[PDB]
Design a protein around this ligand. Structure first.
Ligand SMILES: Nc1ccn([C@H]2C[C@H](O)[C@@H](COP(=O)(O)OP(=O)(O)OP(=O)(O)O)O2)c(=O)n1
Ligand SMILES: [Mg+2]
Ligand code: NA
Ligand code: NA
Length: 326
DNA sequence: CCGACGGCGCATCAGC
DNA sequence: GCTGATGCGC
DNA sequence: GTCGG
C-alpha cells in the first residue's frame, strides 16, 4: 500500500508477459520485484533507489522513473488499447484457460464473457466450471468465512476417520484477513513415504464433503490432489454464499513439514526459498529436502522434524508464516 | 554480457 | 493401453 | 527482466 502504484504496474506487466507473450520467466522476474518493492519500507522516490533492491534491474528502473513522473506507463497504456492483447488477458481470468487456449479462442472469434457462454461446448470440463463460477471466483473470502470453512472441513474429516489431520494452509496460515481460496493439507497414518495401506484415502473425504453439500463441484481429482468448488451453507431468506475454490493436497504423514512449508507459501516465498536452497546446495520440493550431490544430482532425503530444520539446512533464520507473505 | 530461471499433480492430446 | 510432451494450477 | 559466470 506504500508503493501501490509501482507494485500494481509491475504486476500488470507480469500478467501481460505471462498471458500474452507467454514469457514465464519475464513473468516471474516482474513479480519478484513486485514483492521486494512491496516489502520495501519507504515510498520509493526514484528508479535508482529502486534498482538497489534485488530483482530490480535497469528496465524496471526506467519504468519506475516514468511512472513516478507521468503517473502512467506508455508501454502499459498501449497494451490496454490493443484489443487482441487485452482480449487474451480477460480469457485467462477463467480457471482452466491459460495463455494458449485463450489465444486460440481469439483466433476463433471467442473474445468475451458472452462468447464463452454461447460456445460452452468448445470448453473442456475445468474451463466450463471456471466460467460457471467466474463471477464468484473474483471475490475474496474474509477470515470469518475461512474459519467457518475450517470447522466443516475438519469436523467432516474426523467423521470419516479420526486419525486424519487437516491443515488449512495458504494465506490463511499466514494470518491474512482475507484469502483467495481454501488450501487444505491432509495427512493420514495409512499413507507414508514408502507404504500405502489404503487406496481411497482422498476419495473418502471428498465424497463425504460432497455428501454434506459442501463440495459442489470437482475441477481435477487425483489420488493425492484435488481442485474443486465448495460453499458455506446459508440460513433462511439469506442470499447464498459465493461458491469458493478449494484445493486439497494429501501429503504422506512423515513428510508433513515439507508439505506444509509448500502449501503455506507464498509462491513468491517458495520461489525465493527453493532458489536459495539450490544455491546452498539443496533442492526443496513439497515432499522433502535433498542435497545436490557432487554432480548436481539430488541425493537422498535429509531428516526433518520441523519446519525450522528446513530453514536451518539452507542457513536461513526461521520466519513465521505471518512473515512469508511475499 | 549471454542465458539460465522452483517443483510437481491432473488433464489432454499424439504417437505407437 | 502405455509413454511422454504440453496446458494449467497450486 | 535480472543478474551471475
Ligand atoms: N507455483 C506455485 C503456486 C503456489 N505455490 C504455493 C503458494 C501457496 O501457499 C500455495 C497455493 O495457494 P494459493 O494458490 O491458493 O494462493 P495463496 O493461498 O498463496 O494465496 P491466496 O489464496 O490468498 O491468494 O502453493 C507454489 O509453491 N508454487
Ligand atoms: Mg490460497
Ligand atoms: Na537490482
Ligand atoms: Na485462467
Amino acid at each position: 500500500t506504500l508503493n501501490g502504484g509501482i507494485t500494481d504496474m509491475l504486476t500488470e506487466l507480469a500478467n501481460f508477459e505471462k498471458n500474452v507473450s507467454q514469457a514465464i520467466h519475464k513473468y516471474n522476474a516482474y513479480r519478484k520485484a513486485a514483492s521486494v518493492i512491496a516489502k520495501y519500507p519507504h515510498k520509493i522516490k526514484s528508479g535508482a533507489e529502486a534498482k538497489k533492491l534485488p530483482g530490480v534491474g535497469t528496465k524496471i528502473a526506467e519504468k519506475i522513473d516514468e511512472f513516478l513522473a507521468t503517473g502512467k506507463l506508455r508501454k502499459l497504456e498501449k497494451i490496454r488499447q490493443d484489443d487482441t492483447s487485452s482480449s487474451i488477458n480477460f480469457l485467462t481470468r477463467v480457471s482452466g484457460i491459460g495463455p494458449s487456449a485463450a489465444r486460440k479462442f481469439v483466433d476463433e472469434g471467442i473474445k468475451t464473457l458472452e462468447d464463452l457462454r454461447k460456445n460452452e461446448d468448445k470448453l473442456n470440463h475445468h474451463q466450463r466450471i471456471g466460467l460457471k463460477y467466474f463471477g464468484d471466483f473474483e471475490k475474496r473470502i474474509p477470515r470469518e468465512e475461512m474459519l467457518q470453512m475450517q470447522d466443516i472441513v475438519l469436523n467432516e474429516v474426523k467423521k470419516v476417520d479420526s486419525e486424519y489431520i487437516a491443515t488449512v494452509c495458504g494465506s490463511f496460515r499466514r494470518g491474512a484477513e482475507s484469502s483467495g481460496d481454501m488450501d487444505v493439507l491432509l495427512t493420514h497414518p495409512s499413507f507414508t513415504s514408502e507404504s500405502t495401506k489404503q487406496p481411497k484415502l482422498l476419495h473418502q473425504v471428498v465424497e463425504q464433503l460432497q455428501k454434506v453439500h459442501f463440495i459442489t463441484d470437482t475441477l481435477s481429482k487425483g489420488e493425492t490432489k484435488f481442485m474443486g468448488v465448495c460453499q458455506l451453507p446459508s440460513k433462511n431468506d439469506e442470499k447464498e454464499y459465493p461458491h469458493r475454490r478449494i484445493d486439497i493436497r494429501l501429503i504422506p504423514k512423515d513428510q508433513y513439514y515439507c508439505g506444509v512449508l509448500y502449501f503455506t507459501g507464498s509462491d513468491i516465498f517458495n520461489k525465493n526459498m527453493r532458489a536459495h536452497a539450490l544455491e546452498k546446495g539443496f533442492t526443496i520440493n513439497e515432499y522433502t529436502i535433498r542435497p545436490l550431490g557432487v554432480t548436481g544430482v539430488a541425493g537422498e532425503p535429509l531428516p526433518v522434524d520441523s519446519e525450522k530444520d528446513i530453514f536451518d539446512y539452507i542457513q536461513w533464520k526461521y520466519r513465521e508464516p505471518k512473515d512469508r507473505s511475499e
